[PDB]
Amino acid sequence: MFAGLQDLGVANGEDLKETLTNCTEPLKAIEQFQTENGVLLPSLQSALPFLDLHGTPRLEFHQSVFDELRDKLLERVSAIASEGKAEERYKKLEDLLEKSFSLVKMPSLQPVVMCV
Amino acid sequence: DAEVQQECLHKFSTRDYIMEPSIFNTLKRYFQAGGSPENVIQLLSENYTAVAQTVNLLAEWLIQTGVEPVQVQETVENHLKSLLIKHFDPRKADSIFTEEGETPAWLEQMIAHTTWRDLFYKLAEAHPDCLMLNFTVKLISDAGYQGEITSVSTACQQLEVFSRVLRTSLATILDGGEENLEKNLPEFAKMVCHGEHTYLFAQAMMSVLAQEEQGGSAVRRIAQEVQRFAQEKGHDASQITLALGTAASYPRACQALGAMLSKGALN
Amino acid sequence: AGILFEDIFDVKDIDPEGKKFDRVSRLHCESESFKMDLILDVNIQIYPVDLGDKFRLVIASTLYEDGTLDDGEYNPTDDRPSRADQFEYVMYGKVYRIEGDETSTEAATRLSAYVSYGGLLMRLQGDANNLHGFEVDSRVYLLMKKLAF
Amino acid sequence: KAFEKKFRFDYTNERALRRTLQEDLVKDVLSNAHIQNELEREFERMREDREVLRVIFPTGDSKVVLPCNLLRMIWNAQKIFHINPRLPSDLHPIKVVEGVKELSKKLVIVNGDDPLSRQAQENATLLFNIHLRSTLCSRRMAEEFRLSGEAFDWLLGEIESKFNQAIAHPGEMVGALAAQSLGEPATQMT
Amino acid sequence: ESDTGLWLHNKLGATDELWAPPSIASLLTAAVIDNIRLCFHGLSSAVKLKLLLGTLHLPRRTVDEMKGALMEIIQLASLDSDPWVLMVADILKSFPDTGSLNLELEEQNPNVQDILGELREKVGECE
Amino acid sequence: SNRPVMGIVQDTLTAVRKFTKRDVFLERGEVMNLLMFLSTWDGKVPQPAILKPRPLWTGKQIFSLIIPGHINCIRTHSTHPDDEDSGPYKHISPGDTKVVVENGELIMGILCKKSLGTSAGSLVHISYLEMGHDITRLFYSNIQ
Amino acid sequence: KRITTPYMTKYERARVLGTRALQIAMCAPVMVELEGETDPLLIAMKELKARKIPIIIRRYLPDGSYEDWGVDELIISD
Amino acid sequence: LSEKDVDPVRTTSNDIVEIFTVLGIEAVRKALERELYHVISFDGSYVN
């Protein structure tokens, strides 16, 4: 379902499959592959245990971050529609569409492209 | 090994389970099952929704607008702090610290940040019996950021903390001057007169310095202002002041002065 | 029994604002064990009190030891046993207000029960642990007795 | 800030709700989103009425003259049913909302369904409806008055009964009353 | 008296106020402290601190008449685990003798030495 | 002016102010003599405010029998200090001001024209609004 | 389709009681069972309480139209 | 009213005929009501 992440150089599900097929010990491949693919926040590494100590999956954590940032992107694109000089804001919108249209079909990042 | 495969597929079937750092072990158990990884591959290609890519996109997009990244960074950190304060389990945190065998680096990563430091302080407040929380507080003290632990008027009941904060406030007053007389002096007085023990230490130290006149008139002035503020609050601090001075060497006159100053009238 | 509250008080002060009324005196009395303040109005003329006096104060829901919960109309011709036999000053009134250090979330640690004996007011202010027999709009006896110790 | 913190009725803090309401009701007011939508709508209506009052009443003089003395009748309700404003009550806030709304329909001054008639009826009892909403708030009923369900139903009936007796009696000679009531104090001014 | 420990803790255990509770002198006499001395190891730190601070407010005649039990209470306060009680006992030990505060805070109180030194430096700097 | 036009006047008003003071006490004989004059009395002698060493009633206790129904009213006395409501003792008045009537029973306060006169929200006005007109007529007669 | 108030104005009550008392004073049959009262005002008041007064009030609207209300139809204040 | 730095909104004139000629019949009605209220409540009394 990663139609468009191939343009950004993002490793996709096919890459996960081929790494799992050409894997020797699962810990190495899975850990390295999804930790380089994970959110590179320096302080995030300490937050991971505390989320799952109660058994609450970290998927809820990542989805909460996703939803909050989706609210933020909607607000910011509305601000772009409102603030900024006509020429600079139009050029920004054009460039941002050019570099964000790769994920237009995805309902996850659909509001980005749709508002732009 | 069919049930292990079923458990792995149940765990993976939830969307966004790929970002789980735990998945390793679970998926490793799947490699222990010896089954075809086609189900796992298809499910994982169906669960990921580009959360990390969303965060990177959001960062670049917010930088483009013109709003500084400080606001979004602090908003994200506040959300993370809410999540950590709400979903903190002492038992598994202690178990991880015991099983790892060594002090983690990630604890040191959140030691060197103010927001995470306040997170740790509020956790230790909420979870006093959490031993790894106490270890984290110890490491924060080790790192040299002991100022951020409760101080000023909040935690002036401790010996070293009160003495240090009183010394700093006295230095602040003396760096203040005549212009700062109206502003900082009540701020100092409300934290030195919070108790009779802190006030006793303050007045004893004022009397000790007052034996020296090389600018000690400033310390005497500060002590007199503290005395009058304490009287405004309701202290019977005149007996304290007589305990400070040489006047107590004449018990009759000292007792008479205490009488007039507790009464407040010229008998 | 019907004993809502019982303790020993000693009168720390008499009316500090001046004698507002001739026959009634204000008493600021303070406790010994439970450490709760008391503000009371007493008929000084028939029951004189002086500074430093100590007395036993027993607030009771009823005068009868079996707690029959009398209706509350004056029937002097009653031969039943009563508490008023071993007390000197007895007034009957009702509680009309309970304050507290309540917060929006946490419960209350300090209560202050206000009772009116037909005009003569009494505020019993203490920790909430001992003030639980007081429910607003309930009849209450004072049952005060001076101590010789 | 004071108006918000005194009339909003937050449903997020859980300690306060169990302090004020029974446990059978806190889960209802915490779980259902329809209840929270109703409560937010009620507060927004209250804020709009606040602005309307501020444009009707400059200089901030809050001494008004109105038919039913709501606070005294609330006190009467508290004393009749022995409310004991110390234990959590059993009064679902949506009962308060619906009761106020259905009371507002019964106090009719202008009778009719015509849009002109409806506008006249709404304008006639605007001030009293504003006062009624500002007094019988879900939060004020939940933290200040603690009235139970039966007391609240009795109070609604009491307001309806008392208002209908304040209506001007047809055939009243209001002109003579006004003339006398203006002349009489005229004899006693210097 | 009859379980004077509870009496002291409940008269004077207002832990919310670190100040001197009112009429602290009137709650103490020769016999009161004479009974406190043998039961000084059961009461809390707050009650102990209030007692120690109120021992200052006692009248000079009362302090001098029964000064031995005051010395005993101060000594027992110096052996206390709480550093504040140690400091207060060090300050208080000079009352029965002369009346002025003990200026010798230098012993077993390096924090006092640090604060004195840096205050002295700042005072000399801003004369 | 939506206020009463009939009130308590002259020496009846003077004596009701002197009669509800804190230190007014009545023995059983005078209490019975007064209760002989209540038309609305139900025949039950109230429990005295003081039972020992002598059964003594209080002026407020007798007045509460006059007050009709279950009437709730709060006023202030003519000489009520302003600063009292700020400090402590707000609900226990040192000067016995702050007239309070609960359940038709006079809890505290001294009655003056501010509460028994012809003023908006006075005691007789509350009685007329809550009870009928007949009950208020009886209230007037009993007070007098 | 009557639009005037369903309650009884004080003036309607006064005139209705007066008229019914006058009728009873002239040997008109009583619509309620008497318990031993002889004053026509009291009998009329008792009838009005029982809502057995055989009178309908004709209310005149300003426009010239009128509408008729039976006493029992409309609410009695007292 | 036409003078500069003079509020043309709050400025009244205590005179009912002048207000009638300048502002109209509703303005004179409101001003007359306010004047009657001022002359009656001046003693401190109250008329509904």
Numbering used by the authors:
A (entry chain V): 1 to 116
B (entry chain W): 40 to 306
C (entry chain H): 2 to 150
D (entry chain A): 914 to 1103
E (entry chain U): 6 to 132
F (entry chain A): 530 to 673
G (entry chain F): 50 to 127
H (entry chain A): 1347 to 1394
What did the published study say regarding this structure?
To gain structural insights into RNAPII stalling, we performed cryo-EM analyses of the EC species stalled during transcription on the nucleosomal DNA template in the presence of NELF and DSIF, but without TFIIS. The major classes contained RNAPII with its catalytic site translocated either 1 or 3 bp downstream from the initial position, and we built models for the 3-bp translocated complexes (AEC1-nuc and AEC2-nuc). In AEC1-nuc (mode 1), NELF binds RNAPII in a manner similar to the previously reported PEC structure. In mode 1, the NELF-AC lobe blocks the RNAPII secondary channel, which is the TFIIS binding site. In the arrested EC structures (AEC1-nuc and AEC2-nuc) formed in the absence of TFIIS, RNAPII is arrested before reaching the nucleosome, although NELF is close to and interacts with the nucleosome. In AEC1-nuc and AEC2-nuc (left and middle), RNAPII is backtracked with the RNA 3′ end extruding into the RNAPII secondary channel. In AEC1-nuc and AEC2-nuc, the RNAPII active site stalls ~25-bp upstream of the nucleosome entry point. However, the NELF-BE lobe forms the downstream edge of the EC, and the interactions/conflicts between NELF and the nucleosome could cause backtracking. In mode 2 (AEC2-nuc), the NELF-AC lobe, which blocks the RNAPII secondary channel in mode 1 (AEC1-nuc), is repositioned to allow TFIIS to access the secondary channel.
